[PDB]
Amino acid sequence: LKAPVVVLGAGLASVSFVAELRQAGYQGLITVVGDEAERPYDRPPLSKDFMAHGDAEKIRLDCKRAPEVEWLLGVTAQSFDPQAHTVALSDGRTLPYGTLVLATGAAPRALPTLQGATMPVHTLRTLEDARRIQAGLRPQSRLLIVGGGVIGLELAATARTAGVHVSLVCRGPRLMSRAAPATLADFVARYHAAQGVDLRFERSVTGSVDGVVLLDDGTRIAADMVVVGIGVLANDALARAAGLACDDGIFVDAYGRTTCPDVYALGDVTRQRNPLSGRFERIETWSNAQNQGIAVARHLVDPTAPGYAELPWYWSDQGALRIQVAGLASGDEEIVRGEVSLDAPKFTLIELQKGRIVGATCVNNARDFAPLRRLLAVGAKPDRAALADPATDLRKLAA
Amino acid sequence: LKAPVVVLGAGLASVSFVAELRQAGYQGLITVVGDEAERPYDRPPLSKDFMAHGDAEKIRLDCKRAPEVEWLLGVTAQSFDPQAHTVALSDGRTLPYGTLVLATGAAPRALPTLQGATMPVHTLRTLEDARRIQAGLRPQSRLLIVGGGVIGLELAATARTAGVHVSLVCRGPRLMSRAAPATLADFVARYHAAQGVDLRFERSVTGSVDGVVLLDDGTRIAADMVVVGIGVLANDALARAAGLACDDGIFVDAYGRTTCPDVYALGDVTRQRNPLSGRFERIETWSNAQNQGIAVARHLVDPTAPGYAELPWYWSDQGALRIQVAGLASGDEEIVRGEVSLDAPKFTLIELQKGRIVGATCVNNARDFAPLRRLLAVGAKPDRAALADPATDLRKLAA
Ligand SMILES: Cc1cc2nc3c(=O)[nH]c(=O)nc-3n(C[C@H](O)[C@H](O)[C@H](O)COP(=O)(O)OP(=O)(O)OC[C@H]3O[C@@H](n4cnc5c(N)ncnc54)[C@H](O)[C@@H]3O)c2cc1C
Numbered sequence A, B: 001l002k003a004p005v006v007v008l009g010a011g012l013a014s015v016s017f018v019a020e021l022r023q024a025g026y027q028g029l030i031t032v033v034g035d036e037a038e039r040p041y042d043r044p045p046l047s048k049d050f051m052a053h054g055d056a057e058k059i060r061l062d063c064k065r066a067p068e069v070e071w072l073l074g075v076t077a078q079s080f081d082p083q084a085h086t087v088a089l090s091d092g093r094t095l096p097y098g099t100l101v102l103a104t105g106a107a108p109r110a111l112p113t114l115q116g117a118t119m120p121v122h123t124l125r126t127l128e129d130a131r132r133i134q135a136g137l138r139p140q141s142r143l144l145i146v147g148g149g150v151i152g153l154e155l156a157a158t159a160r161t162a163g164v165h166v167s168l169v170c171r172g173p174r175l176m177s178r179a180a181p182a183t184l185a186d187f188v189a190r191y192h193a194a195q196g197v198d199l200r201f202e203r204s205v206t207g208s209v210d211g212v213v214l215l216d217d218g219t220r221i222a223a224d225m226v227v228v229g230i231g232v233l234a235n236d237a238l239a240r241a242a243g244l245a246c247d248d249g250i251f252v253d254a255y256g257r258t259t260c261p262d263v264y265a266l267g268d269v270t271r272q273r274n275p276l277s278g279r280f281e282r283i284e285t286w287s288n289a290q291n292q293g294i295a296v297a298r299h300l301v302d303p304t305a306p307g308y309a310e311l312p313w314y315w316s317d318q319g320a321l322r323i324q325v326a327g328l329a330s331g332d333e334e335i336v337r338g339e340v341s342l343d344a345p346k347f348t349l350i351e352l353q354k355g356r357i358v359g360a361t362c363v364n365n366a367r368d369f370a371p372l373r374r375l376l377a378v379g380a381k382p383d384r385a386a387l388a389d390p391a392t393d394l395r396k397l398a399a
């Protein structure tokens, strides 16, 4: 691979990539440009233990496996010239590159109807966001969440534990409409409702007036704070300007190659093939950020290595629910292991397509999740009666 | 650009590309691999004048502006090795390349429910298809068309003119669901119905038994021949196998670059940015095939040339209706010029979005189409009252 290496973005995907470059044996220059003036850190605690307990030194990413990297923190890459092989920085400097890696992630989507709001409206992506929101998470305050996705629901649980009244507006009929089985989504709504979350389905925010939010059904919700969690948009502006193929995300193959020679991309900023669906998708999971970063680095140092091939999965910690989801949300059959109950929730879902496992969910059942991911990866076709039988040991079965 | 040049596919996009390479001044080797054993030819007459009059020598593409090209006709490219820079051919030979261009187009989608049918079921894409279908286009025979898109409707008109009884099954509520304003689609249904086409909306074919087609509504249609026109699938298998980013189409930027260095793609096989919608789409128009091919070639020979930038448009000749459509099918406003009538049809539609022209349709009104495409290209915001006023001259206005 061509030195020097320059990475744009200093999130999980970037850190994972540069650590793997070093581990795989690349000893040339690596320079990382990160617009946040923060020691690189992991985002999931921002909706949970950080939001609750406030210690950022418990959430930093370990860069020790990435020795001899210059991290330019608090600096924004403004453009790159793919012919000159240079990157223009906000501090006035220019970096040369042999290989450029775009790991710029994604930014929260804003709600146009709250654009000119005069009440506190925040999104939750950065340490700065978390600190700002947390400052207003006072007991008996009223929090309104817009969006029924995982970030909002993680925040909902954390806020309720802090004694914050929580209302949530979801424009669709169900929570977690993206990459979650309906059976899971239905249960998760039941759980949050039972914890005091005031859920509003099939409602959209139409605007706001002096501390009160307005909805499509002509009604009102007053709140001390709105946190908007309606998804993210890829940070692909530099790629678009430089002539790379992008569409809310930079298109890459399994080697992380963009359409521009010597420019790669990885993490949340990418649109890539989901091997289960066979379609291109923006995969915005923590596991993708890390594993795609590692795979792209490994193949750069050793071109005989295979391309990225991992199947997608994530977790979401929502109060008492430790949720794990792998693969596709549905197939032609769902198998349920255990009872689906608010009384000490513990259950496993298995999605199949023509007898083949194409997805799985575990709630408070991590022991089963790893063997199911192994079964999923090889497209296993186990006996559906055995899969249902609670007598069955999935770990054993995966062999 | 790097010699030698090898192009896979010998359709309109390929011919247009190689002619532009030569015209722009590239004098190195060009070899084109075409799986059809046919002198390169244009496809639109296959649903019209060829289907009716049968002379293939009236439909060949002019390769005269492409001198010194070796056309390997009747040969299939089976794979390419992007590291070795070679292409493996079905006749046992291998071609070396400096630059590889994938212009392999798309193939008609098959209908799974007719997979094991015992009655004649054809698609219409090639000269061989056309000849085969035409052999059965006997007066008073009964033709069933599956799909409400342009190819089927063009065939419907040609068949009706030949005295063939025509029934058509469309799974959606309207014809031309892709890239046609609803106002146009509604009128086109009225026209075909008035010409004797038996239109069946919101019906799907569920199967067939001994010369009779079965539908989702539990009913039957008997026919002497079925022509299936339910869209196409990109011929991107070689790209997928070689590790390029694809998803029913090869992703390319405005230079025609794929994710693989030294490999380009153009025409029906590509997924590319539509500058009006700002989204990636497979654009399967004749004008795209030609203009994208020309643009990619021009930039290969002269890297200072801009990338492909044309806005999409097509025509469709359906009996008495000469239809032209440019840009987006809808905006926040449609302006109608003229009466929409089966009595000597002649009218123009203009789609606007926040005052800006984003699309237009002309039916039997070619004079207006060129100035509207010029207005469209520059994002014109004309006075909506003037646009409506039939006193207005659009050609004048476009200046
Ligand atoms: C609140 C929260 C909770 C989460 N919880 C979960 C969870 O329960 N499960 C799960 O699977 N995932 C969770 N995620 C974590 C998530 O999946 C990862 O953070 C993400 O996938 C990492 O991707 P990334 O490194 O590509 O992007 P990012 O983390 O966004 O990093 C990209 C960095 O590049 C910066 N950048 C952008 N443009 C430029 C530029 N021009 N110059 C320099 N820098 C630039 C960005 O500002 C950013 O700092 C959560 C995320 C959040 C925000």
Ligand SMILES: Cc1cc2nc3c(=O)[nH]c(=O)nc-3n(C[C@H](O)[C@H](O)[C@H](O)COP(=O)(O)OP(=O)(O)OC[C@H]3O[C@@H](n4cnc5c(N)ncnc54)[C@H](O)[C@@H]3O)c2cc1C
Binding pocket: B008, B009, B010, B011, B012, B013, B014, B033, B034, B035, B036, B042, B043, B044, B045, B046, B047, B075, B076, B077, B078, B103, B104, B105, B106, B124, B125, B126, B150, B151, B154, B235, B238, B266, B267, B268, B269, B284, B285, B286, B287, B289, B313, B314, B315, B316, B317
């Ligand atoms: C019946 C019909 C009517 C039409 N009428 C209209 C119309 O009214 N308006 C309009 O805008 N467009 C019309 N189109 C025309 C159309 O838009 C063009 O034909 C098309 O866009 C050309 O794209 P192409 O050159 O990329 O692909 P193609 O024409 O499909 O050419 C690709 C060629 O590559 C070959 N190939 C594939 N794989 C390999 C391989 N491994 N090795 C070698 N060769 C390979 C294919 O077989 C094919 O011959 C019509 C098409 C048809 C079929």
